[PDB]
Design a protein around this ligand. Structure first.
Ligand SMILES: Cc1nn(C)c(O)c1C(=O)c1ccc2c(c1C)c(=O)n(-c1ccccc1Cl)c(=O)n2C
Ligand SMILES: [Co+2]
Length: 382
């Protein structure tokens, strides 16, 4: 069931913004590790005396990396005279966020029909305002409300290239890397209490529960009307034998925050080959691969969707496979992206649910908890 109860018109995920201490080094690392191109910048060379912001793109996926300059460069400015290209930016907030949480996501941005209306309706329905609607060069409107922890949901709407004040990056500086990633599939938050978090967000968006179908978590998925914007939220399950990874996140992050970004690939085999080649030369590492029993068990589970050769490719790359009643999911998880055991990335590709492909096809892999535990029966084979 999908009641289509969105309180304003939502289009698609627009960008993810990381708050950094040094945006240059994080952006260059992510660019090489994920195969994303430098597409736009706003920094000292563009007249921005407030913050350095670099935009990476792969298909429709947009990652923004922002860090503050010395406040002294902009001390004479006031908000009416600011050179910042993102008017919600604040030196104090950014430095406080990064000191508290380390490297992580500050903003989940969605494109909407009218960011001013989305903001107004959201706040009228319980959203905690974070930054009021601001019109940039009479062309783009941006507004922000609290999502969870110190993460904001950012609304962007365009009258008719990223944001005014950003310049396209010199082609000499923009190497056309591409490992197959094409869009953001979902963005997952960790909170101490799931119920109040879900009630808050669903309350002010009108997003509905997206249906699914030891683990250390309880979770639920909020979805937009066409189920293309997917915002899962997890809470820890305490008292278990193996400590919940959600609780570990909360401790090392100093509370709620964004846990993982799921990036859709148009060719997950190629994406993982390219990312794995670069793991030890500046890119990203992946979680340990499941035992060979897991891939032996794939035949009975998904042998009608993946050939034996395609199954052997999953084993070579350490890919996980799950299936619901509608479609099939291929997924894999990186190790944490920075120093702390907090945020990580999921790479995903979905098979089925052709209508275009409907959102959430195959679910989110919750079936792989049982399949991993059972398949670690490889102890018996030994
Ligand atoms: C769950 C879930 N719900 N929703 C809405 C999602 O989007 C997800 C995830 O994508 C998802 C799915 C399966 C997972 C893990 C995650 C994050 C995971 O983190 N670990 C895990 C747990 C602890 C340590 C290491 C790992 Cl890989 C696992 O084993 N499995 C099997
Ligand atoms: Co996921």
């Amino acid at each position: 069931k999908n009641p289509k109860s969105d309180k304003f018109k939502v289009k698609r995920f627009h960008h993810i913004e990381f708050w950094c201490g040094d945006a240059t080094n994080v952006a260059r690392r992510f660019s090489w590790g994920l195969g994303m191109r430098f597409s736009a910048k706003s920094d000292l060379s563009t007249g921005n005396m407030v913050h350095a912001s670099y935009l990476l793109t792969s298909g429709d996926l947009r990652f923004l990396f922002t860090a503050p300059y010395s406040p002294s460069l902009s001390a004479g400015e006031i908000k009416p005279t600011t050179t910042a290209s993102i008017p919600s930016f604040d030196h104090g907030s950014c430095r406080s966020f990064f000191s508290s949480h380390g490297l992580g996501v500050r903003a989940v941005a969605i494109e909407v029909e009218d960011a001013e209306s989305a903001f107004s309706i959201s706040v009228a329905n319980g959203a905690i305002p974070s930054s009021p609607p601001i019109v940039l060069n009479e062309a783009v409107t941006i507004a922000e409300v609290k999502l969870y922890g110190d993460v904001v949901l950012r609304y962007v709407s365009y009258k008719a290239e990223f944001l005014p004040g950003f310049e396209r990056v010199e082609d000499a500086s923009s190497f056309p890397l591409d490992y197959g990633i094409r869009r953001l599939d979902h963005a997952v938050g960790n909170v101490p209490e799931l119920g109040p978090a879900l009630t808050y967000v669903a309350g002010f968006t009108g997003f509905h529960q997206f249906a699914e179908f030891e683990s250390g978590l309880n979770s639920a998925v909020l979805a937009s009307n066409d189920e293309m914007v997917l915002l899962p939220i997890n809470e820890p399950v305490h008292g278990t034998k193996r400590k919940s990874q959600i609780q570990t996140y909360l401790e090392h992050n100093e509370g709620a925050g964004l846990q993982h970004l799921a990036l859709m690939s148009e060719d997950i085999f190629r994406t993982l080959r390219e990312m794995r080649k670069r793991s030890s030369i500046g890119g990203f590492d992946f979680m340990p691969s499941p035992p060979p029993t897991y891939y032996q068990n794939l035949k009975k589970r998904v042998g009608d969707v993946l050939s034996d050769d395609q199954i052997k490719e999953c084993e070579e790359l350490g890919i996980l496979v799950d299936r619901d009643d509608q479609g099939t999911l291929l997924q894999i998880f990186t190790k944490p992206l920075g120093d702390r055991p907090t945020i990580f990335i999921e790479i995903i590709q979905r098979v089925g649910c052709m209508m275009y492909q409907s959102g959430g096809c195959g679910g989110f892999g919750k079936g792989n908890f049982s399949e991993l535990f059972k398949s670690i029966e490889e102890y018996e084979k030994t």
